[PDB]
Amino acid sequence: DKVIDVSDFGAIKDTGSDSTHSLYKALQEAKKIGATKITFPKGRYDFYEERAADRLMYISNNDPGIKRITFPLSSFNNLEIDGNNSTFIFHGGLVPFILDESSHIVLRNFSIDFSRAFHSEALIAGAGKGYLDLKFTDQFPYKINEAGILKFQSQLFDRLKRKQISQDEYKYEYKRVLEFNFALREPEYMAQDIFTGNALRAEKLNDVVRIFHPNLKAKVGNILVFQAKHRDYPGVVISDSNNVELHNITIHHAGGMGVIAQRSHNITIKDSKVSPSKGRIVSTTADATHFVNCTGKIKLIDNLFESQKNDATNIHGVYAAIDKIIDDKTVEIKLQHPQQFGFDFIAPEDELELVHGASLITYETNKVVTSTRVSNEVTRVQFIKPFDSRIKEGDSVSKVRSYAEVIIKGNIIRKNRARGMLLNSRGKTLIENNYFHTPGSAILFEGDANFWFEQGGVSDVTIKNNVFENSFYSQWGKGIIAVDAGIDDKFKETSRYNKNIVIKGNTFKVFDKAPILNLFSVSNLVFENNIIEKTTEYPERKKYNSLFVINNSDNITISINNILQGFSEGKSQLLSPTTTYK
Amino acid sequence: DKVIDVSDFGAIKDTGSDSTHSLYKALQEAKKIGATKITFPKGRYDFYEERAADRLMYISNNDPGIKRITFPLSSFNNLEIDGNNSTFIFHGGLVPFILDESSHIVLRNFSIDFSRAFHSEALIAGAGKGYLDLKFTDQFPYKINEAGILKFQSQLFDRLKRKQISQDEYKYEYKRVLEFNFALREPEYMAQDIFTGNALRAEKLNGDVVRIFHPNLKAKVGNILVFQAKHRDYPGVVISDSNNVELHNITIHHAGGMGVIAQRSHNITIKDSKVSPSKGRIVSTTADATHFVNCTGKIKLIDNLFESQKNDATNIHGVYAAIDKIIDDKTVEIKLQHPQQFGFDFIAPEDELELVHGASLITYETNKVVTSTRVSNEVTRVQFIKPFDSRIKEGDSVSKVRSYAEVIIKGNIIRKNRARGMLLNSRGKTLIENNYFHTPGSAILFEGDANFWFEQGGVSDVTIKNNVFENSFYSQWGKGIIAVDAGIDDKFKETSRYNKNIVIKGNTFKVFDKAPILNLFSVSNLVFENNIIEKTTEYPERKKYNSLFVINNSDNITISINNILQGFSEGKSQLLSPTTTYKR
Ligand SMILES: OC[C@H]1O[C@H](O[C@@H]2[C@@H](O)[C@H](O)O[C@H](CO)[C@@H]2O)[C@H](O)[C@@H](O)[C@H]1O
Ligand SMILES: OC[C@H]1O[C@H](O[C@@H]2[C@@H](O)[C@H](O)O[C@H](CO)[C@@H]2O)[C@H](O)[C@@H](O)[C@H]1O
Ligand SMILES: [Ca+2]
Ligand SMILES: [Cl-]
Ligand SMILES: [Cl-]
Ligand SMILES: [Cl-]
Ligand SMILES: [Cl-]
Ligand SMILES: [Cl-]
Ligand SMILES: [Cl-]
Ligand SMILES: [Cl-]
C-alpha cells in the first residue's frame, strides 16, 4: 500500500529464522509501487549471510571489498523504515544498511546488534611480567590451536561446517588490546593501546587463559578489550545519497563505524544511541559517526555515543596527494590511506584547492576541466589554466565543497576510546549543550596531508554551553580542546589552518593542570564566560602545569570574564598562556 | 594499424618502471581499430598495483574479491598478444590476465613471475623435538614481531610506507608446511602436509637462522621446507565466460593460486608452455597448474611442462549445487557450498539440470529450467518445467547438463608437484596420450563429490594411451597410481556406476612397490591391456601394499592377460589377479 508491513512478505518476528529474503521482497515491492513506509511488527528479527545481496563497496575510512547487505537501499526514494522498536540481530559478516544513491530515507525505531561481536573482551584475573591471565565469557568463543595461538571464533564446533567456521576466523582477528576500568566502564586512566598483532601466544592454565606479550600491562579486575583488526561491516553506510534521517536508532555493535557517510547531503541523527548490549563493555569497534566530503546540514541531536573504540564523530574532507606532474596543466592524483582507496570525488568543473603538504597552506584554487579515473588509487586531472609553479609532487589537492553546516547539540560523549569530536569542518559549526567525558581530547582540530590525508581547517566554530567533565584523562590528544593538524614546526608561524572559534558558556571540570586549550596556527579565538572547576576524579599528572598552551597564533583572547573554582592559584597564573606544558 | 607496438604507447623495456598504464592505452587502441596483434619489444617489463584496473571477480576454486588486473581483457576479440619472449614481473597483489567475455585470444611468448612469491621457502638447517631451524634467502623477507610470531613480508623496510607494507602481510600468510627433498626437488617421499595455521611461534637464534616451534613439525635436515600460501587471490591467467583462447610458449613461474583457471568457457588450448619455478625457488604456482570449471568444446593441453606447483597439474570438472530449499513440487533454491565456489552463476532458463542423490552421486532425472533468479553469491532460486522426482530431498544436488568438454591431453610432463597429476572429472570424450607422470599423489584420479568440494565428475569415455607412469603415487595423496575416490558412500558403491567406459592401454608403469596401479570402485566397463609394468627400487617399499589391482563394486572390468610384467618375483597370474583390499 502506502505503508508496507514486512510480515505480509514472510518476515516473522521472534522465530530466529532468517528474514533477509522476505525483507528484500518487501523492499522491491515498495520501490515498485512507490510506497512511503515499511514497518516491522515489534519483535526480534534475525538476518544471516546466505541470502543477502552482494555488492562491491568502497567505504571511506573503512575496509573495502565484497559486502553482504541486509538492507540494500540502492536508488531508493521517499521511503521510511519504522521498526516499532524491534531488535535486529545480524549473524556473521553483514553490513546492516547501505544507502547508495538514495534520497529522503528515514530509519526509525530499531536496534542493531551482531550475534557475536567482532572485537573480544575478557576479565583480567591475573597479571605478571609479560603476561595476563584472562577469563572469557561464553559470548566470546575462542580456541588455542596446536601452534599455541589465541584465535577467536564465530562459534564453537562436519568437514564443510569446519571449513565455514575456519573461514570466519578472519572476521574476529585482533591487532591491539586496551584496558578498561571495571567500575567506570571506560578506558583505564592513562592506559594506552598495546599493539600485539593478530597472533598472541596463549595457553589454558591447567577456565583461565594466559596470553603472552612483553608489553602487556593492566590492573587485575579490569576488562581487556581485543580491538578488531578490520572495519568490514559498518552499521549504516550513507553513500552518494541525500536527505537522510536516523531517529531512535540504537547501534549496539558494528564491524567498524556505527554510521559512515561519504559524499552525501543533509544528514540527521537524532534521539539515537551507540551503546553496548548485555555482557559487553564496548559498543562499535570504530567511530560512532563519521562524515567524509559531506555537504548541507549535518545534525547530531540528543544522541548518546558511548563505549565505542574510537571517536564519537569526525567531519572532514579528502586530501589526495599529487603523485605525478605531467604537463603544466595536467596532474595525476593518488589516494594515500588504504581505507581511502576507491574514493572518487574529482569531477569536471569542480574547484580544487592546491595545498602545500608540510604547511597545509593553499597555493591557489584551480578548476578541473577533465577527470579520468585510472584505478582505485590514481585519477588523472587536467586544469583549466596552468597551476601554481610552486606545486611539487607530494603536495595534495582537495575539493572545494559547500562545506557541511555542522549542528551538534544535546549529545552525551563518554566511555569511548580516543577523542570526542574531530572538528575538521570548514563550514559553519555549532557545538552546543553537549556532555564530554573522554580519555582523549574532547574536541580536536586535526587533519593532515602526510598520513590520514583528511582535509580539515575550520573557519566558523561556536563551542557554547557544553560540559567537559574530567576529559582528556589519558593520552589520545594534547588537551581537552586541542589542535593537532599536520603542520611542520617550521611552518606553524606561517600557516593559519583554523580560524574564528568562539568558546563561551562552557563548564570545564578538570582534575589536574592539563591544557584546556592547546592551540597552534589558530587565528581569532575567544575564550570567555566559561567556568573552570577543579576536581579530584583522577590522580594529577605532573607532566602538565598550564591550562592554556598557545603557540604560533594570533588574536587569541583568554578573557578576564572566566570563572575558576577550587584552585589554589589565581587567574594571574592559571589564565596566562604558555608555550609549553610547563 | 593491424599490429600495435606497445612501446609506441610508452611501455619501455629494461627500465624497472611501471608499464601498466602504457599497456592499458595500447589495449584500448587495439579494441578501437580492431587490431589483431599487440607486440612487446623483447625485454623485461614491470607492472605495479598503483594504476591497475580494479574489478570485482568471482574466480571458481580461488579467492573472490577486488582484483587489480594488469591485462584486463574484458570483451576483447580476435587479438593476439606476442611478448617476443619478454619477461613480465608483477609487483604485489596483481592478477596478470583476466579474460572476461572475450573471444579468439592468443597469448604467446612471455613469462609471468612476481617480485616476491606468495609462498615461502627455507633450507632446514636443524631439527629437534617440536621445532625446526630454517635459513631464508633474501627473496623471502620475513619479520618476527614482539609477540614472537613469524610473519612473511613483501619487503624489508616513513609512517605511510610502514602502513602499506603492514597491509601486505595478508598476501603472504601461510597455513601449512610441506617438506621437499633437496636433491630431487620434489615433495619428500611419503611426507604429508603439516598444518600450522597462519601464526607460528618463532625466534631468531643468536640472526640468520630462524627457529619455528610446533609440536607436529617433522622434517629432514638439509631438505627444504615450503610454507603454503593461505590464499588464492592472484591466479596467473583467468579465462571466464570466454571462448577460443590459446596459450603458446607461456611460462608461468608463479601465481597467487592457480596458473590458469578457466570457468564457463569454450575451446581452450595450452601448448608448448610451462609452469616451473624461477631462480632460487623450488615451487612454482601456489595451487593448480591448470583448472577448468564447467568448460565446453575442446580443452587441449599439448607438449607442456607442469612441475613444482603446490597442487594438481589439471582438474576438469563441473559444479554441483546443493538443493538448499524446496519451495514447491517445481521450485527449489540451490546454494553454492564451497567458499571458493560462491558467485558461480551458471543456471539459466532452458538449461537442463541433473538432479542427483547426494550420498550416492546417482542421478534421479534431468529437468529443464524455466525460471532462474539470483538471490545472493550463494543462493539461486530455480523453477522447473515439470514437477521433479518425488525422491529428491533438500541436501541433494543439481548439476548443469552441458556439452561436456572433449579433453585432449598429449605430450605433457607432470612432476615434482604437490598432490595429484590429473583429476579426470570430465564426462566428455577424454584422451590422455603420451604424457609423463611422476607425482607423489595419484597420477590420475577420478574424484568428484556432493558433500564438500561439490565438483561434478563421472567419466563416460576415457582413453589413457601410451603414457609413462614412473614411480608415481610415492606419497599419500590418493589411493594408487590410477584411482577412483568419488564421494560415494559405501552404502551405495554397489549400485552406483559413476565412471564408465575407460580404456588403459599401451602405457608403461614403472613402480617401486606393490601399491595399486588401479584402485577402482563404482566403475563399469574398463579394459586394462597391452601395458608394461616394470619393478623399480627408486623409493623404499611400503609394506601395507600388496596388490597392483584393487577393485570393488564394479562390473565388466578386464585386467587382460596380454599385459607384461618385468622384474617381479611372483607369477604373472597372481600379479594380475584383482583384490578387494590393499593386501590379503
Ligand atoms: O585521526 C584520523 C583517524 O581517526 C580515527 O582513528 C585513529 C586510529 O586509527 C588510531 O589507531 O588511533 C587514533 C587515536 O590516537 C584514531 O582513533 C578514525 O577511525 C580514522 O578513520 C581516521 O579518521
Ligand atoms: O579435490 C578437489 C580440490 O583439489 C585441489 O586442492 C586440494 C587441496 O585444497 C587439499 O588441501 O588437498 C588436496 C589433495 O589431498 C588438493 O590438493 C584444488 O585446488 C581444489 O580447488 C579442489 O579442486
Ligand atoms: Ca562469452
Ligand atoms: Cl554563552
Ligand atoms: Cl592550583
Ligand atoms: Cl604542545
Ligand atoms: Cl614541558
Ligand atoms: Cl645462528
Ligand atoms: Cl602393514
Ligand atoms: Cl602364471
Residue numbers in the entry:
A (entry chain B): 25 to 181, 190 to 238, 241 to 616
B (entry chain A): 25 to 181, 190 to 238, 240 to 617
Relevant lines from the article:
To trap an intact substrate complex of the enzyme, we targeted this residue to generate an inactive D344N mutant, which indeed lacked activity on pNP-α-galactopyranoside. Crystals of the PdGH110B D344N mutant were soaked with an excess of αG2, and the structure was determined to 2.20 Å resolution. The monomers were organized as two noncrystallographic dimers with identical arrangements to the crystallographic dimer observed in the PdGH110B d-galactose complex, supporting the concept that the dimer is a stable quaternary structure. The C2–C6 portion of the α-face of the d-galactose unit in the −1 subsite sits on a hydrophobic platform created by Trp-486, interacting through CH–π interactions often employed by CAZymes. Notably, the architecture of the −1 subsite leaves no room for a sulfate modification on either C2 or C6 of the galactose residue, indicating that PdGH110B requires an unmodified d-galactose at the nonreducing end of its substrate.
Overall, the results are consistent with PdGH110B representing the founding member of a GH110 subfamily that exo-hydrolytically processes terminal α-linked galactose residues in λ-carrageenan while providing general insight into the specificity of the family as a whole.
